[PDB]
Amino acid sequence: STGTFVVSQPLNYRGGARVEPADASGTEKAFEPATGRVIATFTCSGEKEVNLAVQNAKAAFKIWSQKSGMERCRILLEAARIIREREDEIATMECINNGKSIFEARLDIDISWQCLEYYAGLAASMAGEHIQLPGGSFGYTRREPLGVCVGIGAWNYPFQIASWKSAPALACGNAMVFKPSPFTPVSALLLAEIYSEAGVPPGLFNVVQGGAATGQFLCQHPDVAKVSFTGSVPTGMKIMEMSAKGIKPVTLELGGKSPLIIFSDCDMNNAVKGALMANFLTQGQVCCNGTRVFVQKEILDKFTEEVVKQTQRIKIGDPLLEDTRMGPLINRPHLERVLGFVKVAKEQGAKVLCGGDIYVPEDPKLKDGYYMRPCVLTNCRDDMTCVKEEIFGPVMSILSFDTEAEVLERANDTTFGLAAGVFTRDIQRAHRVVAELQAGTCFINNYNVSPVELPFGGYKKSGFGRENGRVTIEYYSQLKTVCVEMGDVESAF
Amino acid sequence: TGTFVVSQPLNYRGGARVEPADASGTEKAFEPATGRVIATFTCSGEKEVNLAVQNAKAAFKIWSQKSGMERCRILLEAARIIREREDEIATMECINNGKSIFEARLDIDISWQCLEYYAGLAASMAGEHIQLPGGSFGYTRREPLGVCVGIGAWNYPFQIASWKSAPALACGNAMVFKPSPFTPVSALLLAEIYSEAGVPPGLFNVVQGGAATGQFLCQHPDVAKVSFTGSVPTGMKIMEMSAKGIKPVTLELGGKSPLIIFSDCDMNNAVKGALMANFLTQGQVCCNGTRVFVQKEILDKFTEEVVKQTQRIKIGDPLLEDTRMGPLINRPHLERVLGFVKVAKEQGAKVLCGGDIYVPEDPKLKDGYYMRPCVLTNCRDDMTCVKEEIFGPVMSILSFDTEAEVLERANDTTFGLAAGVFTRDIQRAHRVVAELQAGTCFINNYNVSPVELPFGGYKKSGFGRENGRVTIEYYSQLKTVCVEMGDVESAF
Amino acid sequence: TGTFVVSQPLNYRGGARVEPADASGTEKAFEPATGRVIATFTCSGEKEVNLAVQNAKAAFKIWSQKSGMERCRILLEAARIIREREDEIATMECINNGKSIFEARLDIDISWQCLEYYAGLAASMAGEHIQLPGGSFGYTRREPLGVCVGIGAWNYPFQIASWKSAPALACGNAMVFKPSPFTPVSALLLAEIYSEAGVPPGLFNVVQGGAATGQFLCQHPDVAKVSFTGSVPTGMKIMEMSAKGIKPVTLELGGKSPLIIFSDCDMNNAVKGALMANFLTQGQVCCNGTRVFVQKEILDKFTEEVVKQTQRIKIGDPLLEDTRMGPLINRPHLERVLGFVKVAKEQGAKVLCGGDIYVPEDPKLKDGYYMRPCVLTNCRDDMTCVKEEIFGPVMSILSFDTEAEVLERANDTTFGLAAGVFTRDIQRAHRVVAELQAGTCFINNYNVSPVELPFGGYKKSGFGRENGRVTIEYYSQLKTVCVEMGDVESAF
Amino acid sequence: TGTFVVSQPLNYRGGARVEPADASGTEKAFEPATGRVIATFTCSGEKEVNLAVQNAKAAFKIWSQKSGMERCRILLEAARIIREREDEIATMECINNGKSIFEARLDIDISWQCLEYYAGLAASMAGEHIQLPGGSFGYTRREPLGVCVGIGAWNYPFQIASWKSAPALACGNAMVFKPSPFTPVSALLLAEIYSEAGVPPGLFNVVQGGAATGQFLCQHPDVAKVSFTGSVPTGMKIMEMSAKGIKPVTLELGGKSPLIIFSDCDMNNAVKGALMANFLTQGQVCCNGTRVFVQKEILDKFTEEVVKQTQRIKIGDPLLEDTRMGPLINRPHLERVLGFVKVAKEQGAKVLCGGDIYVPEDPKLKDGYYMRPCVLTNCRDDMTCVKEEIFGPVMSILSFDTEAEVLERANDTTFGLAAGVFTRDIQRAHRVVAELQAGTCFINNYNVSPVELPFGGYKKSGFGRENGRVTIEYYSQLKTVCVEMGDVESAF
Numbered sequence A: 001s002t003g004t005f006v007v008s009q010p011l012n013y014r015g016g017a018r019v020e021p022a023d024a025s026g027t028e029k030a031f032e033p034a035t036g037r038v039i040a041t042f043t044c045s046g047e048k049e050v051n052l053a054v055q056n057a058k059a060a061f062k063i064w065s066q067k068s069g070m071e072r073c074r075i076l077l078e079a080a081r082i083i084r085e086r087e088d089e090i091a092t093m094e095c096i097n098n099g100k101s102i103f104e105a106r107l108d109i110d111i112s113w114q115c116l117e118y119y120a121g122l123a124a125s126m127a128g129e130h131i132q133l134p135g136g137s138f139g140y141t142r143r144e145p146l147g148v149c150v151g152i153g154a155w156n157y158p159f160q161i162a163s164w165k166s167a168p169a170l171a172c173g174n175a176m177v178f179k180p181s182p183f184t185p186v187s188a189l190l191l192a193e194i195y196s197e198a199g200v201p202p203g204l205f206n207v208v209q210g211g212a213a214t215g216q217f218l219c220q221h222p223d224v225a226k227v228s229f230t231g232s233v234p235t236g237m238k239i240m241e242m243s244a245k246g247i248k249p250v251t252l253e254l255g256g257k258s259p260l261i262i263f264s265d266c267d268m269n270n271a272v273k274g275a276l277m278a279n280f281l282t283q284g285q286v287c288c289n290g291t292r293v294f295v296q297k298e299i300l301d302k303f304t305e306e307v308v309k310q311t312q313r314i315k316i317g318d319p320l321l322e323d324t325r326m327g328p329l330i331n332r333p334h335l336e337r338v339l340g341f342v343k344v345a346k347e348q349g350a351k352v353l354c355g356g357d358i359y360v361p362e363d364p365k366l367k368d369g370y371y372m373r374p375c376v377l378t379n380c381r382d383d384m385t386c387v388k389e390e391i392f393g394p395v396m397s398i399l400s401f402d403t404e405a406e407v408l409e410r411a412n413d414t415t416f417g418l419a420a421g422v423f424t425r426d427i428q429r430a431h432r433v434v435a436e437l438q439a440g441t442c443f444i445n446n447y448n449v450s451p452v453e454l455p456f457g458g459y460k461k462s463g464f465g466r467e468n469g470r471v472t473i474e475y476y477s478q479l480k481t482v483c484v485e486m487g488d489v490e491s492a493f
Numbered sequence B, C, D: 001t002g003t004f005v006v007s008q009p010l011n012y013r014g015g016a017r018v019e020p021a022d023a024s025g026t027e028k029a030f031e032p033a034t035g036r037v038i039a040t041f042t043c044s045g046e047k048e049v050n051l052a053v054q055n056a057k058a059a060f061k062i063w064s065q066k067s068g069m070e071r072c073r074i075l076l077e078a079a080r081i082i083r084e085r086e087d088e089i090a091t092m093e094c095i096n097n098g099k100s101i102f103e104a105r106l107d108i109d110i111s112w113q114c115l116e117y118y119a120g121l122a123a124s125m126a127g128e129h130i131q132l133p134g135g136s137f138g139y140t141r142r143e144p145l146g147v148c149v150g151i152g153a154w155n156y157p158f159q160i161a162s163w164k165s166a167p168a169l170a171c172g173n174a175m176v177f178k179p180s181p182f183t184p185v186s187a188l189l190l191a192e193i194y195s196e197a198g199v200p201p202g203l204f205n206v207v208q209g210g211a212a213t214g215q216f217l218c219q220h221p222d223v224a225k226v227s228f229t230g231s232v233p234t235g236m237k238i239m240e241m242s243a244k245g246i247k248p249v250t251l252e253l254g255g256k257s258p259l260i261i262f263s264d265c266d267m268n269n270a271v272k273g274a275l276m277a278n279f280l281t282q283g284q285v286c287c288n289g290t291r292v293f294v295q296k297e298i299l300d301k302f303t304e305e306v307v308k309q310t311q312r313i314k315i316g317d318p319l320l321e322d323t324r325m326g327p328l329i330n331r332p333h334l335e336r337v338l339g340f341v342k343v344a345k346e347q348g349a350k351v352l353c354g355g356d357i358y359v360p361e362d363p364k365l366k367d368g369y370y371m372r373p374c375v376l377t378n379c380r381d382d383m384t385c386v387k388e389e390i391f392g393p394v395m396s397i398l399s400f401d402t403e404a405e406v407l408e409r410a411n412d413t414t415f416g417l418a419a420g421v422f423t424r425d426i427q428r429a430h431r432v433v434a435e436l437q438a439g440t441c442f443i444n445n446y447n448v449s450p451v452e453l454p455f456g457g458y459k460k461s462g463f464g465r466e467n468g469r470v471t472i473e474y475y476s477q478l479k480t481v482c483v484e485m486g487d488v489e490s491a492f
């Protein structure tokens, strides 16, 4: 089914229906990265269209916020059921536009409906407090929604980010206007269609397409109560600056340069597999990837030789093939960026052990796709450009270390702080290393296995706020303190 | 109460009072009751701010190693010392701020109670543990942020320092606190009390200064979080500066809170509530109910009662036991408030009492910044005194007819800090409260915010909270730790 | 009229018509006189835009090698061919645009006169030579820019194509022109005439499309300069896109031009001038004097004389010799103009004539987009129809007393394209013009902008010029060449 | 040197130095020769921008009422005061910028010569008058724009302030100038001199700040024009903000200019020329020829002579008469430049001399930002140091064979500011220059841009000009005035 699809319907979603935008802020083209074709050339939403989206979602927020948590729970569970029933239709579209393998996309759709189910349950038990106060009086808190929340999505995990941002928002009683990445506009509309079929009020989850301008219109609309952003550090900085004009709360996911520390007492088989899962999923375009692979000197050769052997066995090809594990990168400009990082690595003294070059698949229909082979680098130094900056491609930087105290200083020597990983069997070293890692999510003896039940978010310049877990409720709801006087007012005058 | 000047330096680093290393300005602190200066002091420059920030993460690495119970014990010692120094702190608070000794003691009590509440919260501070599929599991570590910055306001100086420092230190953080340049004195007493309690040197540092000093604090790369209390334009700047460092922010931005008086209310309590909603601390309160909506059927009787009690408010020396309204914070702010009254009367509002300069009988107070509490009637929603926060003793009384009408007008603000309802019908009370877009809602009282519950803004009054349990989430962060109990299932 | 359809491709490159290589969607062109669809065509995509730009870049490499006189020779041939095919072009202009053949002939005249004017300017185009100290000297080469982009509008299609192409080609440039999707037809006739005149194939290419095609043109890395004619919101978009490539921009964004009639004027000329300032090309003229300020002493006689003449304007088939107002461009724009009239009547304006749909006698014109020209009185500066450009035949008459009053109101606009004053006092005439913040000012006439002088915007009406000599500076650039006649005096 | 410290406020409004009203942060300017801070100043907030822009508007209405000769007289006085304070200004320029006193004297000379040149241009500033058909005629008024914004750079602070202010004020405009935060001091001296010369207070205002302050200036609704000098990314950002207000912009964005040395050149002149093209102002120059192409037959002899002379460049105290290279502007820029050398050595280039930190003999200079001038050989067109502007003393020497090859390689850049050719063949000199896509081309010298000719960018080096006559077209605009000498001929 690759090289076969092109968008038929309009790409914005309002009033529980698909719509072309009212006014424009540009025209982008979305590609099929496996082939290079243009699946879509569409219009970026202008100010009047963005205003329609927020306003139409504000009317839906009025309806949605009146239901109890259990009542909202019922509807989000139905949306989760429709996602399970349309998983293969959703996943296939996600692959066509994003480029990741069908194998991973099915797992992405799994994490998407599990997020909806998890937050549906959380909605049913959402609560404030009740506190006995002196003199018979008491106080209580109403956990209330915020209003119209804005979600600005990213292209690497398009449908999952739409599900990870909308699920806690709508479960807390909010509506959402979601702006997908211009690279991946298609899949978010399927989630918007699924929410309406599940029975949400029309407008509760609206989709506006666009780029930087559209997102700026969304972050500055006076009726947007909260902004959830996933993207780069420079852009996240801009998102917070725009929200300052309206006193809007912000949560952020800004990528990372997460460390993966492999000690010599580790299970080698798990450490090799873990390093691959920490670097080459979704073409290496994963924010929380363990891209600084620290290997203790005693196991560097055995680890490196095994990692290179398994990396070279990654099947590259048609994303819709069952055995494919790496498809094309998102688009050519990002492929050249990743290839540029590799060229500088060789100039700075790093040794390319495999991959890092253009890949031409056997299938002629994939000739113009944006393919490259996964790359493993060794002889890396903390001062290398490929070691400091997020590459967002399949580029594993292997660095040697000697002592635990040394590697912790190097692991924390970053402005990033999204994720981290340690491979070791010593119980005390495992819990100690993780406690010192300045990162939001830390993996012991695995990687990229973030569950839906626990918070995911950044430390330092990787952002603040969380997705998944219970604490995300605090970012999509707010507590109103209500004091109930049970006696008379004792005046001071 | 007309005799004090500071004799010691006004910055606090390394567990001792010290003078700033460099300068960003030079400001004068006043005793408002007399108008005489109590201090001309140096505003902390960039290098002094750097000295206070790095000295604070020297103490943050020592403090975060302690468990919650270990921090609880020490914060409990600080709370006890505050109780023992109640009259020394309160008297010092009065001299510099101007509020009555009656109120200052209540502020100092609410301050040490805040420390006790967060010391106790530290003792039970916890993450989660969750069983995951296949026998594996995950857990969350509730970790501190690092060096937190507290930017204080002048209305409740010692209490704001305690409301910001208590959850920070209870979560394992250090704090560098920048008091308002108007009120620099009391914050040092809290720093001395923290030191006597046994905190690591540097855990609570104080740097005095204004916008320049505050800008240096918000932009330092080692500042992990900013808590701000002040105006909307300045809070706006605080958020814009914090974007440069990806620093999380909590904000308390004042308000224009509505107070709705229904005809079924207890008149005596509703009248007292309106006074308590407007004239504490010279009307200089974050969350005052300054738009007092009174139902038409009871408007006249309510108005006549509120004015009768307002005229009986004792104005004078804050250190006198019977004083209930002292001077305003400083002369420029008194003229700002007096201007609001003059513009209100230009727009058609009827001044029923006060709003004018007061000259007290005691000759030592002749140059103090005094005025009589003001009651306005015949007010309209489009008036400046009805739209803008005055931060003075100016109650605007507006009439309303139906419940549906007053709900739309009460919410007709960019603010959303507090709100108040007086009524005896249980259904209307909780219904009005549920619709009021405000952070704290008082039913049949006002300004009775407990430490056990969150205080914070809706809409342009800010976001985040102080007091209560949810405040933990803004002074700590959760680290997810996944623990693999089996083998890694690779996709390749 | 009522017979024509496009039967050939609507894009032009390589000296020949061609259909686009890729699509941006499809639009339908109309015969506004009948509502007939005369063309359904494809909007050009990125690959078609790239073909036109590179094909223009190759033609630019040839064209720029010729001297000014050599370029003059070819544009003079193009000017002659336009004169010989004038009525064929005009007839084509009417069918697609709707303006009368009377006006269409005048537009085609200014088109070939523009080519002749710029052909002559090319022959003398020059830089400088300046003697510098020490016997050395410097000189400037006035060089072309490269591939320039012209974004056309629908009101004056062929004239806008000629006003953009003439200075571009005279300065040594090539041009890729994107006509308005409403009026794609007439620009191709100019492309055929350029080819017959002897330009290298590709020197003037035409790509059809809407916003997407225009976006591709402004962002192509080989586009050296963009000239835009249209609305203020779109002009902003043109500038935002051109910043990405550091491409020069000149803009004409319409206006809300004031026409000031003083009581000492010639009444007969002032009345006729007001009509020429409002009802040419169905009022779809950017520089129209649509705010007609009339001094109070002559308001009634001017208004009644203006209304009498407006009601005598013959509306009908534009290709008839007696027609002076045709249909508006398309149904959505006719309804937009009618909306301005309906809202004007709601805001308190008095419709004296017109503003309604017109049904012509000819049954073949039944579905054309016709309306009667409208004259409004009792207008106020704060009305929507007084501030915003209507782009239809809607004259707003406003009274004024003094010169100081009318100058403040005339300039109380963000626009600044044109202006007009009628008065016989010599000092007042030149004085009013000097105070008018407008690009072109007419004294005792209107809409008589010559090709020998610049036409362009002030304020949010745009910047840059068309016509006149200064336009050379926007389609050419100066290279400074220093020629050392001695030795280098080193500083080291 | 080492002595100076800024005493007075650094913003300039209403004729005097003034502290900004609100703040947008704090920045420190240093004495680069020593590293001692010379000024820690406030960055102008939004309210401060609104003040300076408004104060300049009132001076513009006064200053534009004078004729050109009247403006000429006043600008001539400003040029004279610069000559009388030349030694004071240059010394101040060195202390903050770091350039040698030798070069600073040349900068102040080029600055007052610019004012004299534009004073004279004001004296002859004119529009046109053209006889039109039928006895009627038209004329153009060359009118100012209003308040122009000048955003300066740190390499030539006083000259960039003078190159931007002179043509603006000569055309009748006012200017608010935002210096680069690195070098704020010298611009205040130019503001003091303009006031002493007799300009109306507010005509030339100075606001200090960085990106935020510049953003407020470029987006203010009363700013009529923006002149920018800086980097490609920031200038791009400057254009995007000006799109919101339809503001005209001229830009100078630096370059990567080629210097072509043919084998028939005078070796002695080409060697000196290569040094002048690379090591003036510590190599921090807009239009430096940092891609030095040397023909294969003369590569070896030219290289060793370039290296012999480069090693003889005296590095030391900028205020010393014999110094020819001072420190770089600041530590981040020195480390950035040193990085370019580190990347060059990684890409395979051979460092022939310099490129390393320099520690001067004078003990007061230990913490200055000094480095040795660097010469690279074995360079390739695809190297990072060959493509990217280094803005430091780094000459990249590349070998070439034929003229056709070097022309393609010289133009193989997105930049287009300057270019250079050394040859004695008359045809090759003028032929090479005509093909080089660069704004200024030097024949047998380099960096000798005269004030009588335009200097500006091609391609991504920007658009618009400074110096010369055409710069008037960017600081003035033409109003066309049609003068009807007969009656209006109505079409209806």
Ligand SMILES: NC(=O)c1ccc[n+]([C@@H]2O[C@H](COP(=O)([O-])OP(=O)(O)OC[C@H]3O[C@@H](n4cnc5c(N)ncnc54)[C@H](O)[C@@H]3O)[C@@H](O)[C@H]2O)c1
Residues within 6 Å of the ligand: A026, C151, C152, C153, C154, C155, C178, C179, C180, C181, C209, C210, C211, C212, C213, C214, C215, C218, C229, C230, C231, C232, C234, C235, C237, C238, C252, C253, C254, C255, C286, C389, C390, C391
């Ligand atoms: N100043 C003039 O001479 C003039 C002429 C005609 C119309 N107008 C004004 O323009 C108003 C709007 O009518 P419009 O809808 O024709 O104006 P518009 O400016 O949208 O269309 C102008 C041209 O720009 C193109 N365009 C549209 N979006 C673009 C984009 N994003 N990037 C690049 N090119 C783009 C259009 O295809 C058209 O050719 C009219 O109502 C009238 O006021 C002014």
